[PDB]
Amino acid sequence: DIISIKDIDLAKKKVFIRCDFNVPQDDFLNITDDRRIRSAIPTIRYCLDNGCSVILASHLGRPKEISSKYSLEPVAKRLARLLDKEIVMAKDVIGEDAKTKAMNLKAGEILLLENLRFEKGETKNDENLAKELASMVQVYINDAFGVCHRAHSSVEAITKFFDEKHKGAGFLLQKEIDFASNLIKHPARPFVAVVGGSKVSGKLQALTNLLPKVDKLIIGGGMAFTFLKALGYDIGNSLLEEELLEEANKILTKGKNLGVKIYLPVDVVAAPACSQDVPMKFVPAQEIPNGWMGLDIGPASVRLFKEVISDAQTIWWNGPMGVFEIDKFSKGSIKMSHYISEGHATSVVGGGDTADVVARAGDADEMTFISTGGGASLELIEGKELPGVKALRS
Ligand SMILES: [K+]
Ligand SMILES: [K+]
């Protein structure tokens, strides 16, 4: 149903590619993870190989207003090394400099527009922005699954300025869609969802839609403590969403009614504060000391979870098992990455935090697929129609 880049005649044309270059940066604005730039390359190279000129556009962060801090200039440098091709940068998005550069662009050249979100209309699906972006090119390609869950100009309104023979989905967008969709369709079984992170409300809708689909569900991260609390466990000073206690109980009740095997941590790494520099204890989940907090799954839980996933043919994992940015509270996530990656399941990772764990674990290459689109994969797993994808439906 979705129009593919493969069914569009784009040879020798001028092509707008909406890419996802929303990469992490450090305080000196050096790029600390270029995976999204790398994932964009096959679509870009396919156009260049077909004699196109290429206008690339992406957002970076969420600028409130224009500043050098959110410039795409470091993305341009990094992409130039990775493609071994030179890049022209526009000083603006649809101002005079972009339009002139776009018009001057020769076959085989690459133009990177400045941050899309320097235009206030982008996150409002402004139709004038869309029209101005569209005027620069003959073909529209979306390769940015990561923003497709939002009605933004560069993925939604812009598509109204191209007919079905001049717009389509890039190779990355198609993969993101195929991997996410499989999971809510007919995945190989046993199908295990492994869910984590610190908030239940983050995952509630995904869990509700996955529940009738999965064979087993492991719940870790800070969000587990709301489930344990919903079951009457004392959780000391751990994270709690009081207001979601009843919803968590509903997940467990329906899970059981549907025959889903649901596992929560049976032990945790507990500490008096969330820092490297305080003491830590391995304790049962029923015995977090007064005033202490659970910050990672414990070794018994790691081991149980290993056994839970051991016969899996499909695993979806979104969310760390614990506060993995702190070394002392990272081991449960790291070992889960090891166990998931080393097993024989089709393994699909979601969430930037989870991609980060998998990177630190050194396992990125043994995962079947790591989504580089944060909330977008989740909203698909939730059962929603994504406006960016809909926009490209034949
Ligand atoms: K046009
Ligand atoms: K594997």
UniProtKB/Swiss-Prot annotation:
UniProt keyword Kinase, yes or no: yes
Keyword field: ATP-binding, Cytoplasm, Glycolysis, Kinase, Nucleotide-binding, Transferase
Residues noted as binding ATP in the record, renumbered to the chain: K203, G294, E325, G351, G352, D353, T354
CC per GO annotation: cytosol
GO biological process: gluconeogenesis; glycolytic process
EC identifiers of the protein: 2.7.2.3
A GO MF label: ATP binding
Domain of life: Bacteria
Binding site for substrate: D20, F21, N22, R36, H59, L60, G61, R62, R117, R150
Pfam families referenced in this protein's UniProt entry, alphabetically: PGK (PF00162)
Catalytic activity: (2R)-3-phosphoglycerate + ATP = (2R)-3-phospho-glyceroyl phosphate + ADP
UniProt-annotated location(s): Cytoplasm
Pathway field: Carbohydrate degradation; glycolysis; pyruvate from D-glyceraldehyde 3-phosphate: step 2/5
Similarity-based family: Belongs to the phosphoglycerate kinase family.
Subunit structure: Monomer.
Protein's name according to its UniProt entry: Phosphoglycerate kinase
Species: Campylobacter jejuni subsp. jejuni serotype O:2 (strain ATCC 700819 / NCTC 11168)
